[PDB]
C-alpha cells in the first residue's frame, strides 16, 4: 500500500528533475542573452562616439 506511493513518488521526482534541469541550463542561456546584448550595446558606444 505504501510501496505504490513510493512509485508515484519516484515518478513525479525525476519529472521534477527533468524540471529543474531544464530551468537550469534556461537561466544560463537568458543569462547569456544578457552578456551579448551587453558587450554589444557597445560596442554601439562606435557608432554613437563617432557620430558625436
Amino acid at each position: 500500500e505504501n510501496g505504490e506511493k513510493i512509485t508515484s513518488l519516484h515518478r513525479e521526482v525525476e519529472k521534477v528533475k527533468l524540471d529543474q534541469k531544464r530551468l537550469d541550463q534556461e537561466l544560463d542561456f537568458i543569462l547569456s542573452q544578457q552578456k551579448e546584448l551587453e558587450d554589444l550595446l557597445s560596442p554601439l558606444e562606435e557608432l554613437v562616439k563617432e557620430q558625436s
Binding site: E1, N2, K5, I6, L9, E12, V13, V16
Partner: protein
C-alpha cells in the same frame, strides 16, 4: 510410552519456542514507513510548487 511423552511434549514445546521467537520479533519499523512516505510526498509537493 513414557519415553514417549518425554519427546512429544518436547517437540511440541520446541515449537512453542519458535512461537515465542516470532513473538519476540514484532513492528514499529513498519509503522514508521507510512509516516515517512506520507512526509516525502509532501516535500515533493513543495519542490513542485517551488
Amino acid at each position: 510410552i513414557c519415553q514417549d511423552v518425554e519427546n512429544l511434549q518436547k517437540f511440541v514445546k520446541e515449537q512453542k519456542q519458535v512461537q515465542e521467537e516470532i513473538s519476540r520479533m514484532s513492528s514499529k519499523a513498519m509503522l514508521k514507513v507510512q509516516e515517512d512516505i506520507k512526509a516525502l510526498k509532501q516535500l515533493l509537493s513543495l519542490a513542485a510548487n517551488g
